[PDB]
Amino acid sequence: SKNVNDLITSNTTLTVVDADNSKTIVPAQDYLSLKSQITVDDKVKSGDYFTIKYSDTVQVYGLNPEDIKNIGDIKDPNNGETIATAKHDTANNLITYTFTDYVDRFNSVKMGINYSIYMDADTIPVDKKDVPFSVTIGNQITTTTADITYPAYKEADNNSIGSAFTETVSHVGNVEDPGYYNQVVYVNPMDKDLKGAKLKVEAYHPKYPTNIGQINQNVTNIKIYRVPEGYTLNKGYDVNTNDLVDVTDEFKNKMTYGSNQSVNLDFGDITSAYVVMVNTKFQYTNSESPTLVQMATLSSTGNKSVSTGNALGFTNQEVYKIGNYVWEDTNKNGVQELGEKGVGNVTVTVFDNNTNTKVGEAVTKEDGSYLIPNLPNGDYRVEFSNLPKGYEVTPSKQGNNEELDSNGLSSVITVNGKDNLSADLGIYKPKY
Ligand SMILES: [Ca+2]
Ligand SMILES: [Ca+2]
Ligand SMILES: [Ca+2]
Ligand SMILES: [Ca+2]
Ligand SMILES: [Ca+2]
């Protein structure tokens, strides 16, 4: 088991996508498209591993940290097998992929990845031109740049405010735990002297009567921090709380929950900026496409009230695959071995063996692969036919391993809670 970064080579693209066509690049709105075709040296063996490292300005999820699951094992799309398993170490900006026995069973291994990844605002607190974003696949660095341009804080007279959703874990349709979301509110980011300041945060908007936002004393947790003099707030709403002064204890008597998913924070007379962190639980919903809206309004004496807010939309038996290999069993021993190659143009026909009803069919590709999808748990008869002329069927069920043997022309396999890729056929062509 060793690092084989020097035994892969890739054609990689890393592209900044202006997702909202704003003509500006903002971490909260835009994203990075990473694509790579990776060629793996034949010397690589199972348990070897390669890494994908990304720069400090890159992260592998957006608002939902559970989206890390979208960047997972690398699979062969033709035959359904896993080529390498993925392990994230987000603290080290690292993905480690460990090769499976795929690379012991096949030469000329090639892999594709197609990921959406995200910009990390942690080190981009303000507008900056030519910010680099880098991904290192094996030993090859792919670097792209973009100008980062954040929106301005909302203002009304001497009142100013900003807000963003910073984390959303939504389980739409789950009654036990609908999930949670976090919002950050910058209070008075323009650093003014405001008289009788009050902040109203509300999961309420007249346009959204089915809002799944929720604010009340039982589900909501609020932290308040004072911003030191001269501190530059992160315009991407990445808050390093160690840089700020926790003043949550000072907002007893000043914290009031109210109707329509509201909470009111009485700041009084203030001369600094404040960061308000709001953690709260989603409401449950039956709907397929719910909406979350949460507003924040700062009011003070002698100034127009300023409002800002954020809005987001969300989304709400098992079947499996059978396969997957017809190969030319050169040494006739009935066992799939490295260097023996797949056979194309062989017909596979699959039946539910308990009803004798046809459930799928395929023709093997040039690499010998086939897949039969959409099969629930059951017993399935797999019939091979239309072998190449001159070829004979190799001996069946050799080698004491039903994943590496030949099933013969007709056999029955059981699908039980996972893909069953063990219905394989070995053939050879006699010369004598
Ligand atoms: Ca944009
Ligand atoms: Ca290999
Ligand atoms: Ca063999
Ligand atoms: Ca088998
Ligand atoms: Ca197989």
Tokens matching residue 30? 């835009």
Distances (CA, A) of 195 to 154, 206, 232, 267: 18, 29, 23, 9
SS3 letters for the chain? CCECHHHEEEEEEEEEECCCCCCCECCCCCEEEEEEEEEECCCCCCCCEEEEEECCCEECCCCCHHHHHHCCCEECCCCCCEEEEEEEEHHHCEEEEEECCHHHHCCCCEEEEEEEEEECHHHCCCCEEEEEEEEEECCEEEEEEEEECCCCCEEECCEEEEEEEEEEEECCCCCCCCEEEEEEEEECCCCCCEEEEEEEEECCCCCCCCCCCCCCCCCCEEEEEECCCCCCCCCCCCCCHHHCEECHHHHCCCEEEECCCEEEEEEEEECCCEEEEEEEECCCCCCCCCEEEEEEEEECCCCCCEEEEEEEECCCCCCEEEEEEEEECCCCCCCCCCCCCECCCCEEEEEECCCCEEEEEEECCCCCEEEEEEECCEEEEEEEECCCCCCEECCCCCCCCCCCCCCCCEEEEEECCCCEEEEEEEEECCCC
394 Cα to the center of ligand 3, angstroms: 9
The residues with which 119 forms a beta bridge, in sequence order, are 58
313 Cα to the center of ligand 5, angstroms: 41
Tokens matching residue 226? 């004072």
With CA atoms as reference, report the closest residue to 123 among 166, 59, 69, 194.
Answer: 59
State how far the Cα of 109 lies from the Cα of 102, in Å rounded to an integer: 8
404 Cα to the center of ligand 4, angstroms: 6
Shared domain check, 170 and 125:
no
The number of the ligand nearest the C-alpha atom of 428 reads: 3
State how far the Cα of 218 lies from the Cα of 292, in Å rounded to an integer: 19
Are residues 362 and 340 in contact, defined by beta-carbon separation less than 8 angstroms?
no
The number of the ligand nearest the C-alpha atom of 27 reads: 1
18 Cα to the center of ligand 1, angstroms: 4
Task: Give the strands of the sheet with 221-226, arranged side by side.
Answer: 154-156, 159-170, 179-187, 274-281, 221-226, 245-246
Shared domain check, 279 and 200:
yes
200 Cα to the center of ligand 4, angstroms: 65
Are residues 78 and 367 in contact, defined by beta-carbon separation less than 8 angstroms?
yes
426 Cα to the center of ligand 4, angstroms: 10
With CA atoms as reference, report the closest residue to 279 among 268, 266, 263, 290.
Answer: 263
Q: Give CA angle at 28 (22, 29), nearest 5°.
A: 30
Q: Which amino acid type is present at position 38?
A: I
- CATH number of the domain within which 267 lies: 2.60.40.1290
With CA atoms as reference, report the closest residue to 415 among 350, 345, 333, 326.
Answer: 350
The number of the ligand nearest the C-alpha atom of 146 reads: 1
List phi, psi (to 5°) of 392.
-120, 160
Shared domain check, 309 and 164:
yes
- CATH number of the domain within which 140 lies: 2.60.40.1280
Sign of the Cα pseudo-torsion (363, 365, 369, 373, in order): negative
Tokens matching residue 144? 């792209």
What is the number of structural domains in the chain?
Answer: 3
Shared domain check, 308 and 162:
yes
Shared domain check, 275 and 204:
yes
Distances (CA, A) of 132 to 14, 54, 88, 118: 11, 11, 22, 13
State how far the Cα of 13 lies from the Cα of 74, in Å rounded to an integer: 17
- Residue after which a domain boundary falls, among 296, 313, 330: 313
State how far the Cα of 264 lies from the Cα of 42, in Å rounded to an integer: 64
The residues with which 128 forms a beta bridge, in sequence order, are 148
Shared domain check, 330 and 307:
no
The number of the ligand nearest the C-alpha atom of 30 reads: 1
State how far the Cα of 83 lies from the Cα of 97, in Å rounded to an integer: 9
Q: What is the resolution in angstroms?
A: 1.8
168 Cα to the center of ligand 1, angstroms: 20
The number of the ligand nearest the C-alpha atom of 395 reads: 3
The number of the ligand nearest the C-alpha atom of 46 reads: 2
**Distant-in-sequence, close-in-space partners of 201: CB < 8 Å, separation ≥ 6:** 183, 185, 215, 262, 263, 265, 276, 278, 294, 295, 296
Shared domain check, 11 and 44:
yes
Tokens matching residue 231? 């501190």
With CA atoms as reference, report the closest residue to 234 among 181, 180, 273.
Answer: 273
Sign of the Cα pseudo-torsion (222, 228, 229, 232, in order): negative
State how far the Cα of 352 lies from the Cα of 167, in Å rounded to an integer: 46
Method: X-ray
Q: Which amino acid type is present at position 307?
A: S
What domain range is 360 assigned to? 320-428
Shared domain check, 378 and 342:
yes
- CATH number of the domain within which 337 lies: 2.60.40.10
Shared domain check, 307 and 167:
yes
27 Cα to the center of ligand 1, angstroms: 8
The number of the ligand nearest the C-alpha atom of 24 reads: 1
334 Cα to the center of ligand 1, angstroms: 57
188 Cα to the center of ligand 3, angstroms: 73
The number of the ligand nearest the C-alpha atom of 402 reads: 4
The number of the ligand nearest the C-alpha atom of 47 reads: 2
- Residue after which a domain boundary falls, among 279, 294, 313: 313
Are residues 140 and 12 in contact, defined by beta-carbon separation less than 8 angstroms?
yes
The number of the ligand nearest the C-alpha atom of 339 reads: 3
Shared domain check, 304 and 173:
yes
Shared domain check, 257 and 142:
no
Are residues 367 and 108 in contact, defined by beta-carbon separation less than 8 angstroms?
no
The number of the ligand nearest the C-alpha atom of 322 reads: 5
Sign of the Cα pseudo-torsion (233, 234, 238, 243, in order): negative
Quote the radius of gyration of the chain (alpha carbons, Å): 29
Name the pairing type of β-strands 420-428 and 320-328: parallel
The number of the ligand nearest the C-alpha atom of 423 reads: 4
To 10 degrees, the CA torsion angle through 42, 46, 47, 49? 40
**Distant-in-sequence, close-in-space partners of 150: CB < 8 Å, separation ≥ 6:** 26, 126, 127, 235, 236
Sign of the Cα pseudo-torsion (62, 66, 71, 77, in order): negative
Distances (CA, A) of 11 to 6, 139, 144: 15, 12, 15
Shared domain check, 395 and 278:
no
ω into residue 324 within 30 of 0, thus cis?
yes
Q: Check the chain for breaks (C–N over 2.5 Å) and list the residue before each, or none.
A: 316
415 Cα to the center of ligand 4, angstroms: 13
16 Cα to the center of ligand 1, angstroms: 10
